[PDB]
Each structure stands twice: as structure tokens, then as C-alpha cells.
Amino acid sequence: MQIFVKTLTGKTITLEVESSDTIDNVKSKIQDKEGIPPDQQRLIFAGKQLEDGRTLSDYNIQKESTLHLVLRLRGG
Amino acid sequence: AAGEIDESLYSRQLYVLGKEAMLKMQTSNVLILGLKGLGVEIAKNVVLAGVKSMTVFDPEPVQLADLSTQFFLTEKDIGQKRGDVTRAKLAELNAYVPVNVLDSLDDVTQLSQFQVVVATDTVSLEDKVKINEFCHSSGIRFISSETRGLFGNTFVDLGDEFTVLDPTGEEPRTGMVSDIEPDGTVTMLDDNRHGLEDGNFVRFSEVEGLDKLNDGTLFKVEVLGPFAFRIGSVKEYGEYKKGGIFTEVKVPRKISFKSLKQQLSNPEFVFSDFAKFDRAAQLHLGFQALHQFAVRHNGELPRTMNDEDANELIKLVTDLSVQQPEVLGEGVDVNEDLIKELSYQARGDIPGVVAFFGGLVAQEVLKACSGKFTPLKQFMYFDSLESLPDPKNFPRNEKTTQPVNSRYDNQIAVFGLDFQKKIANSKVFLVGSGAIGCEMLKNWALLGLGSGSDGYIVVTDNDSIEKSNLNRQFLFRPKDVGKNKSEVAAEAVCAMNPDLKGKINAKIDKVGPETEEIFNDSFWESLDFVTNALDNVDARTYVDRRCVFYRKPLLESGTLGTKGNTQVIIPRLTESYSSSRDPPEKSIPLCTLRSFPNKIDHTIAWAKSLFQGYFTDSAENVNMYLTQPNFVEQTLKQSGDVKGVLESISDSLSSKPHNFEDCIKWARLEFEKKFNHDIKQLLFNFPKDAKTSNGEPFWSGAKRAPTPLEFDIYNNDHFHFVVAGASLRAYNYGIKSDDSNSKPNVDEYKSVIDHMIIPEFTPNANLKIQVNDDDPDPDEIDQLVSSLPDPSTLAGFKLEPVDFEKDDDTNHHIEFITACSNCRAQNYFIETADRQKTKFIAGRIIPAIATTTSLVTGLVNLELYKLIDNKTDIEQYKNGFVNLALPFFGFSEPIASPKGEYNNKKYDKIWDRFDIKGDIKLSDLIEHFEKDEGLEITMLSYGVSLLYASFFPPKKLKERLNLPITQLVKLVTKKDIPAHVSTMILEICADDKEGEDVEVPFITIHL
């Protein structure tokens, strides 16, 4: 199935995944595309931050679901 | 005579919006209808950003309850008109923006003089529809917004034809090309990602063999992988030979909006929070219901906490859904609890919600004026119902929520009187008083936070107010420049709400390790919570550590242009800021900088370092050598670069200039060295046509073959390099400029330089030049020491070092770096950059604007409500993430603190610790752990130094076991513990009851 990852700069990445895939795995795939180390990735979906070692199924992530890859900013 | 922008005021905003956008903003007249909280907040942000004119319309009399969120009203203004009374205070925010009052809007025709019209909560739906219809059909941009307690919305309608010039504000993607196949497949050089999306457009330059592919034509991108994209067939243009750089181009997009009338019955939503997406339709109905209600009840909203009126609202909503089952979709029920709360809270005026919509709508006004960023299309609804406290602690009914005839009445309307008093008796520490800081203090003035006899606010900030701050630090005026941020901010908000007179302790101390004597155990322990308003990571990390140590909640936020974020750190519940890594600042390889640049970022880096060395380091080194008798002996045995330092002194003292003319000469000789001789040297080792072991050309990809510069005073960069170099050199040596009262004169410099012998270049045959950071680096120091003059021949000779100040245009710094970078850019055929861009990179300036700052601060004060109620259900808290450019809002439940176990005992790996009362003896500490915790201490340490280990032999145990921890540290470190220290953190390792090593909490010793 297909999910989307939207970045904070508006970019849309598309991923090929299965419901049983670990978040670890989705981060792995995002690293292949963007070059972002899994440990620097903050993924959020439907009000939860996605944690390493849980599955896509655990967060109720369906086909066509959109995850957001977000950041913290140092200005103030 | 306008069409130019004040860089010294707009500096940081300018890096968000750009010059074109701001020139359009400077031709736009904006009209704001209603000047309660929402209106004044929108107006403030728009006036700060600098539009051509601001006009405000609110003929209503000021009432006490209006002060809930209208920070420019005072009790003295009661009875007078909101518009009249606010006007003068908005004007003070930005002297370039006239602020006018519309007396009357009986004639809708008067709208034609404005380009954007904004309708706030004061305007009925009937009038919003009339006004929108007039605007839409006349080409006037229309935005509306409403807050009702913890709910809110915004609507955007920019007309039939609106063009977006830049959807995001991001730097266009760029990159180096190694191949272009005939079918259009573009492969990136090495392992560089293009970073494009399908349907981006690109242009090319330097692609040899495809002539007209470089002519500015755009190509649509088909992404093939991370390292390739396709542009359609290019066999028509020729055949690829080598080279090439691609550059993303943003193309214009035409979009159309619908009228409010159409969108009421058939809306397009943008979502504020995807966890709540089902609520958008419901609230859309609900907010229309409130207007229908008002029409039935002579313009009144539902009564605060009132069931009769809430049931009427639910009926009204159900009639809209039964009549049109297409806003909710087929077979979907009204959410009656949600609508009930909308009724209950309809009169509420909540500071954080107002701040959210104020920032948002203000940015939408700016988009509307400029075509910069993607507009909100077309409706967004929002709520922060999680901010409601538990009714078991703070019950809500008609009695607890009734007005008490105070400025807080429409906050009381939502939370109750009791909750509001707990806000006032809170004790808070605010770390920073800049952008977030000023917005924070305004929000706290509006909350009455710290205003009660048990409460206070401490705010500290160690900076003084600079001019570019005024663009988003709205509590500061031009005449406050040079004063301290915290002190001025504290005074400013006390005028806003006198309930804070003598309740804010404005400090000017730098938070960090050198101020723990001030910000000490007692200071921190006293607080209820801490809020960051900081501009750097290390400070956030430090406050985070201390919040963990003292077990205090922390409210964190940050911005970068239109992007922003909030984070909540709750003791015993969530992870802390330090728990997660952010992407680090990428470093440029050393060889790229020194010999093989290809981006202006590289030439600026190189030029900035040259600046340090020419005008800061070489002077500090001379001063050390003249004042430290042991300097040369010190340098010889504690420097990696010894020879650099000694030549820097020898050079500094043998070339001593006597006048400005000598400074000019020096600078012209440095031009020859850096942009002529060094380049001819690099080309001596690596000729234009040099090859490598494989037989492929040395200069390809990231390596651009340089040409030496032939000095040309008519060239701007060559001129300014010499002007700025000479003027800085003069400053070092205490010489007066011919420049220090007026402009540099070309003929004056020319007549010095024209009479100089410039020495011809001879190559050094033994210089190795490092091609990679992998590859290695490859007596006369006794001669260099012999060359140095005795410091007694230079009695009282100081060189004055330069201290980089990027925000003073008279000081030559950015002038130098810009010119020096660009001369190097000319060398390597890199596009030269201007002062504003060089200042951004050299100065590490963070793009910033008031819109994002208010909105993010708003969201922080919606989480603050949750601290006041001591919430322990992690699911109630929201970390936020925004980008107003898109616009995008997302939220996430904080991550729980990781937990552990030793023996049968669960513990928190961030928050839990062993508190030991007293300067305990080592033997008693080891025993306490086995007896009371089931733990066999295995190592015990204090910072770097090891105090006890189970492998110690008996001789060593005898020395240590009977010592108090302070004397034990004394034994090992040979330091006293200082007097001021009242706690000591000890790290331990331990075995559990099975004899297995287990991870365990740290120890705090309370002296």
C-alpha cells in the first residue's frame, strides 16, 4: 500500500509499505529518500508522535494516509 | 520618493518575505473591522510588517470586559470608542504606517479604497456576507475571523483570480549535474540529492553540449529516484558533454476563491489538527448557529454556561444538518456535546486563542497583499478543549463562571473564578524577553498571571534592545533602543495591566553555569513552572537540565520564519527537550573551503575567517605577546598551529603603518596575495588541464578551475575590498581614516595604487596542497623567535581588535566580508552575492516575523492552562508544529518518559533520583543502598572523577569508607567543594539482588 509523508517545507514523499511494518522501517525508507537519520526524524499522525518499535497498524495508518515529518526551531 | 525598504528595521522580516513581497505590502491599504482582542492583535501584526496604511473601524464603546484580550485598552478608556482609543497605540508600533479611523461604514462603497478588508468577531454574519459580496465582486480581498472561548475560525476569499508567486518561501533547490542522457534523465554528481518533487520546474546553466538548455527555459521535473530526475527528451538540444548546475524555479499559480455565501453551504476546509478533523464540519455549523441565535435574541450570544440556550443552539445546528446533510455527510449525527460547549463558551475571550488567530490571520493578510506563500483556502476551524480543567477540581456552572465585574470576566466565563485565581497566584520564570518573550508577557498580563498575592513573574534577559528588534518585539519603541529588554518589557506590560505593578522581577542576568549563585536552589524550588523564550539550543538544553533536576514543568517554543513549534515537558510524565536530537549544523569540508569552493557559502566562510585573522586574532596575539612574558614559551608547547601565530606577530610588528596611505597599500598587496598569487600557486600545482591516476580531468564536479584577478578599481568588489581592508587595518593600529567622516573616493585610492610596485608572482615548487580531508597535510621556528622584537621596545603599544558587529553599516565589516567573498567568487566563477545576503550567512541571522511569534506563543499559553490543573493524563497535552506559509498545523501527544526496573521497583529514567539528606559518609551511602534499595553499589563518581568502586583493594577502601562525600571528593580531586555548592549529583552503577548490573537513577546529595 501507499502512504504519504509531508515535510514542514511542503514536500510530499511517497512510500511503499505494509500495515505490519515497524516505524523503524518507515524511517529507514524515509532515510533512503531524504537522507535524514532515523534518530532525527519526528513523525506525527492523527495527534500521535510515531515511536520506534511500534507498527503502522498500531497507529491506525491506512492507505493514502499522510504522515508529517516535523522539526523544532531555535529562533525566539 | 518610495520603492525602497528600510533594511535596518525590517532586516529579519526581509529574510522571510523578500523584497518584492514587501514592496507590494507597501502599496496595500488594509481595513480592520472590530478592534476587540482579535482585531487589535491582527492589526498589531500587520502594522509591524509594514503595509501602506492601516484603517480601523470600531465605533463601539469600550467596556471593562473588552480588556480580556485587548492589550491596548485601559480602564480609563471605558465609555469611549474602541477605534479612537486604539489608533494612537497602533501608530506607535511602526512610524512608516499611518493608522486611521473610519468613523462610519454606512456606505459600503467606502470599501473601494482598501485592497484587503478583514472582518472580526464584531461583524454579524449578515454584514460579513454583504461586505464579502461587495469585496469579491469589486476585486477586494476579504478575510474574516471569529474567536468564541476555546474555539475559533478564519475564512479567506481572495477573489476570482489570485496569483501565488511562491508557494513556500524555501530556498530554491540547486545542484550539480554529471550526466544528462538523450531521454532527459539527469543524474546528480556523486551522492548529492536533487531534493525535488514531481512537478517542480528547473533551469540549467553550464551544461556543455546542450547550448539552449542553458538559456533560461524551464523544464518540468519527473523524479526517478533520490539521485536522478527526468526532464523530457533533450536530443533536440545536442548531446551532453560535461558540467552543469540546475536551479529550481517557482512558477506562478492562478487560483480562485468562492464567496462567503457559497462557502457557507459548501465549504473547503483546511484543518488545524488532523486528530480533530471530524469536528471541522460540526463547528462550521456551530458558528453559523451562533449568528442565527443572535438574530433571534437581538444580537446577544448564548448565555455563559446556560443549558436552555445550549439546547437551542443544538436545535439550530440540527436544523442546518437536517436541511443540508452535505456539510456533515450522509447518516452522520450532530456532535451535541461539542455544540453544547460552543454555546457554553461563546462569550469567552481567551488570550491564547486570540493570539493564534491573530498571528494566523495577520499572515493571511500579508499573503493577500503579496502573492507570497500559499493562502488558506478557504475555512479553518480550531479548538483547544483539552485546556479545560477537570470539573472535579474547578467546577463550571452559571455561578462559578459569572462576571465579577473585572477585566478577566470573559476568561472567567470559560474557566471559573477559582481557576483564574490559581493563574494569578502562579509563580513563573520566563527565560528571555525578546520576540517570544514580549508576546509571552503580553499574554501573561492579559491572563493576570502572577498578579495575586501568592504569585509573581521573574523574567531575565541579558540583551539590550537593538533597532531590528522593533519589527517583532512589540513592547519596545525607537527611544527604548540601547536599554535592557527585560526591564522595558516589564514596565510596558504593567501599563497594559496595572494588576502586575510590582509583581514582575525583571533581571538582566545570563542564565547558565556562571549565574547559579543567583539562580540557585531556593530560586528554582519556589517556582510553579518555567517558560523558555530563547534563541539558541544550548540555553534550551541548560534550562531543560535544571527543570529536570528541580522537577519543574517547562514550556518550550521556537520559530524560524513562518515555521514554529511548541513542546511541553511535564515532571514524572514526558520526555524532556534533551531526550531527542535535532539535525546538526552541517560543516563544510576543509579542503572545499581552502582550495575548491563552488558556492557563495564557501567564499563567505573563507572570507569571514580571513576577517577574524586579519583584524581580530592577529591583534589579540600581539597584545598577549607584549603583556605575557611567558607567551612564546606557552605557544611553542600548547598550539597545533605554532608557526601561524609567530608569523602573525612578526608580520603585525614589521609592517607597522604610519598613515592611512600605508593601510591602503597593505590592502592592495593583500588583494594581490589572495586573489592573484595564491591562485597562480594553486594552478601551478594543478594546471587547468591536469589529470588524475584514472586519466580524467582534475577540475570537474565540485572543482572549478580559478582565474587570477587583475585588480580593477572600477570593479565594486575590488574597490571595497581595499576600502574596507584599509579602514579596518587603520582601526587596528589607531590611525584616523580619510573615510571616518564621509564616503570613500575612487580617484583618491586610485592615485595611491597607481603609484605602487606590485611584486610579480614566483611559484614555490615544494608546496603540497591537500585535495581531501582523508589525505595527509604536508627549525625555521628558532629564526622566527629571533625575528620578534623585544616587548620593551613597544612600551604601551596596543593593537585594537575588531569585534564583529553585523548590524552596523558604518563599520566596514559586512563591507569587507562581502567584497572579499565576492573577489574569491570571481576567482572561481561563482555568482557574487550582495551585502544583505552575505550578512545573512556570515552573521548566521535567523529569519523572523511577528506573525509566527504570536501564534506559537498563543499555543504555549493554551498548554499553560494544563499545568495550572496539574494534568497527569499525557493524552491531554499537545506539542505543536506549524508553518504559516503552507499553511500547516499539526499536533502530537508528548512522548512518555522512558521507564526502568531494578529488583521489583519501577523508576523514571529522566525524573527519578535518590535524594540523600546530608554530607553522608561513603560507608553509610553504600549500606543505605543495599539495605533500602536492594542495590550493591559497583562504581560511584562525581563528574569526571571516581570515588568508589567495588574492585578497590582494602588499603584504598580504608582511606575512603569513613569519609563524608565532600572530603571524599577532596581526597580524589584535590579540590575543595566550593562554599556556594548545596547539592552534588553522583552517578552510580550497581548490581541488583541477583548480582546483575542494572541501570538505576542518579543520586543528589543535599549538603
Ligand SMILES: *NS(=O)(=O)OC[C@@H]1C[C@@H](n2ccc3c(N[C@H]4CCc5ccccc54)ncnc32)C[C@@H]1O
Ligand atoms: N528570539 S530573540 O528575540 O531573537 O531572542 C530572545 C533572546 C532571549 C535572551 N537570551 C538568549 C540566551 C540567553 C541566556 N543564556 C544563554 C546564553 C548562551 C548559553 C549557554 C549555556 C546556557 C545558557 C545560555 N540567558 C538569558 N537570556 C538569554 C536574549 C534574546 O532576547
Ligand SMILES: [Cl-]
Ligand atoms: Cl525577492
Ligand SMILES: [Cl-]
Ligand atoms: Cl511595486
Ligand SMILES: [Cl-]
Ligand atoms: Cl489620537
Ligand SMILES: [Cl-]
Ligand atoms: Cl455576533
Ligand SMILES: [Cl-]
Ligand atoms: Cl549559533
Ligand SMILES: [Cl-]
Ligand atoms: Cl561571530
Ligand SMILES: [Cl-]
Ligand atoms: Cl548594533
Ligand SMILES: [Cl-]
Ligand atoms: Cl537570503
